[PDB]
Amino acid sequence: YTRVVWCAVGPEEQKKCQQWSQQSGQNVTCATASTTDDCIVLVLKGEADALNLDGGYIYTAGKCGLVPVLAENRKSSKHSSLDCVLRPTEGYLAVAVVKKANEGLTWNSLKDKKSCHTAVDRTAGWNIPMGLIVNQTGSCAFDEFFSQSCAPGADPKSRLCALCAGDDQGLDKCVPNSKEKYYGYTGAFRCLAEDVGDVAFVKNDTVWENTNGESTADWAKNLKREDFRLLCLDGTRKPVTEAQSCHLAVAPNHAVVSRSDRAAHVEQVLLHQQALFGKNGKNCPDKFCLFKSETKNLLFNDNTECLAKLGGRPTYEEYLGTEYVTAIANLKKCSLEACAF
Ligand SMILES: *[C@@H]1O[C@H](CO)[C@@H](O[C@@H]2O[C@H](CO)[C@@H](O[C@H]3O[C@H](CO)[C@@H](O[C@@H]4O[C@H](CO)[C@@H](O[C@@H]5O[C@H](CO)[C@@H](O[C@H]6O[C@H](CO)[C@@H](O)[C@H](O)[C@@H]6O)[C@H](O)[C@@H]5O)[C@H](O)[C@@H]4O)[C@H](O)[C@@H]3O)[C@H](O)[C@H]2NC(C)=O)[C@H](O)[C@H]1NC(C)=O
Ligand SMILES: *[C@@H]1O[C@H](CO)[C@@H](O[C@H]2O[C@H](CO)[C@@H](O[C@H]3O[C@H](CO[C@@H]4O[C@H](CO)[C@@H](O)[C@H](O)[C@@H]4O)[C@@H](O[C@@H]4O[C@H](CO)[C@@H](O)[C@H](O)[C@@H]4O)[C@H](O)[C@@H]3O)[C@H](O)[C@H]2NC(C)=O)[C@H](O)[C@H]1NC(C)=O
Ligand SMILES: *[C@@H]1O[C@H](CO)[C@@H](O[C@@H]2O[C@H](CO)[C@@H](O)[C@H](O)[C@H]2NC(C)=O)[C@H](O)[C@H]1NC(C)=O
Ligand SMILES: [Fe+3]
Ligand SMILES: [Zn+2]
Ligand SMILES: [Zn+2]
Ligand SMILES: [Zn+2]
Numbered sequence: 001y002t003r004v005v006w007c008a009v010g011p012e013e014q015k016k017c018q019q020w021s022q023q024s025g026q027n028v029t030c031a032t033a034s035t036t037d038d039c040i041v042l043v044l045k046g047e048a049d050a051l052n053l054d055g056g057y058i059y060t061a062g063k064c065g066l067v068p069v070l071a072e073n074r075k076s077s078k079h080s081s082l083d084c085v086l087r088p089t090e091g092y093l094a095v096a097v098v099k100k101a102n103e104g105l106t107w108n109s110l111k112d113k114k115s116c117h118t119a120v121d122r123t124a125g126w127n128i129p130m131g132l133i134v135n136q137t138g139s140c141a142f143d144e145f146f147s148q149s150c151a152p153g154a155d156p157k158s159r160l161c162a163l164c165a166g167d168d169q170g171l172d173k174c175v176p177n178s179k180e181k182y183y184g185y186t187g188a189f190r191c192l193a194e195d196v197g198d199v200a201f202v203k204n205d206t207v208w209e210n211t212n213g214e215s216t217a218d219w220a221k222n223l224k225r226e227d228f229r230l231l232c233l234d235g236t237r238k239p240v241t242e243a244q245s246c247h248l249a250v251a252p253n254h255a256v257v258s259r260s261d262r263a264a265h266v267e268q269v270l271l272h273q274q275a276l277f278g279k280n281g282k283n284c285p286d287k288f289c290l291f292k293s294e295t296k297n298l299l300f301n302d303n304t305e306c307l308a309k310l311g312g313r314p315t316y317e318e319y320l321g322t323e324y325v326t327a328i329a330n331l332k333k334c335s336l337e338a339c340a341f
Helices: 010-023 036-045 055-063 123-137 184-193 204-209 240-245 260-277 316-320 322-332
Strands: 004-009 028-033 050-053 066-074 092-099 114-117 148-150 199-203 228-231 249-251 255-259 304-308
Touching: 004 010, 004 036, 004 260, 010 028, 010 260, 028 036, 036 050, 036 055, 036 066, 036 255, 050 055, 050 260, 055 066, 055 123, 055 255, 055 316, 055 322, 066 260, 066 316, 092 123, 092 184, 092 204, 092 240, 114 123, 114 184, 123 184, 123 199, 123 249, 123 322, 148 184, 184 199, 184 204, 199 204, 204 240, 228 240, 255 260, 260 304, 316 322
Parallel strands: 004 028, 004 050, 114 148, 114 199
Antiparallel strands: 050 255, 066 255, 066 304, 092 199, 092 228, 092 249
């Protein structure tokens, strides 16, 4: 009847998927690939059914005909009466973060500094801040704005990979998967925290989830929120408490996508799966938790309360919203219809 194949990106996701697999009695199973881009291709081929993606990849996948099915939903303050699965999604704040101790650094003095990005093509780590930088500079030359960076998915021998560290052994430098030490929200933030870089483009939640004891990770257990500052677009710096007033943009939530002809089936199984291994699930911290991976954000972001139904039966353009879609288009003109494969 119903069996779903999930696409895991890199070996750590693979491992988490295998566990979910064994726990679901094989109701879910796993395919693995090296990059999100490849995973998308497996789905198009029909060798994989689904994966959860950042909005920048939702855009890629969309041109290829894939569709959003369920969105990530994190703890809400407003919109409280509704059960999470039917609660509207809020979106996340894309911020630029720096060290307080690095005085005098503002949005207007980023040129020639060192940067930490979650990965090329992602929303908070790339699309927003690079689009803004392309716009106010007039130049499509974004590889030349920062002196060095860690930008996973960029050419390993270019300046945009210069700060990436690879794995344990120094292998896989700048691969866009968790093998790369400075990959994703948590890796970019760690890139700033270790003073490898001057600024990190991550979301508001990351700063909080890795400071003041929220993470027992050794590179973080000792970090304090007051030690960081957010760069606002008007040239000022604020405490990380002012995010709602000092952000680069509001990002659409990460969401699960699948081929359109598989959407109904994918939706059904996952709804059941969260009942079982979700935030309050039947089995959930006893045997297995779909939304926990030790601050690593494997398959899903760790702050996910549930996957929510969409309503309005959104196309991918509707889901990301016209504002966001026009920034990608304009940025994409730098390096308008097709499917990237
Ligand atoms: C940037 O990202 C970071 C990291 O993710 C965000 O920080 C997180 O934000 C969330 C929610 O926004 C935090 O909420 C969590 O914390 C609580 C405990 O840890 C949890 O329980 C809360 O209990 C309450 C129950 O509804 C909620 O608020 C309460 O509601 C009343 C008013 O809001 C009020 O009760 C009475 O007293 C008032 C007196 O002033 C009266 O006026 C009222 O009328 C009423 O009688 C209480 O004051 C009370 O606060 C609350 O929302 C929670 O439900 C909760 O489960 C949740 O998990 C989360 O902890 C936090 N993480 C960290 C590390 O801080 C940050 O918000 C982001 N910021 C932006 C701007 O985007
Ligand atoms: C980098 O720089 C590029 C190039 O300028 C910039 O490009 C874009 O800039 C803006 C940002 O979206 C965009 O403006 C559009 O404005 C109107 C209005 O869109 C509506 O907004 C209101 C309120 O939300 C509402 O009417 C609708 O709900 C829409 O959301 C848009 O369409 C108009 O629609 C109304 C009716 O709805 C109509 O009366 C008008 O005649 C008009 O059709 C415009 O067409 C614009 O699309 C720019 O258009 C867009 N510019 C280009 C060249 O594409 C990027 O955003 C910048 N990149 C980054 C990351 O910042
Ligand atoms: C594997 O998937 C099936 C399909 O939902 C689950 O078994 C179903 O259980 C529900 C609730 O009792 C029934 O309504 C269905 O008719 C059952 N289907 C069949 C054919 O067995 C089962 O719970 C799933 N297992 C796990 C661990 O996820
Ligand atoms: Fe994202
Ligand atoms: Zn089936
Ligand atoms: Zn805003
Ligand atoms: Zn519609």
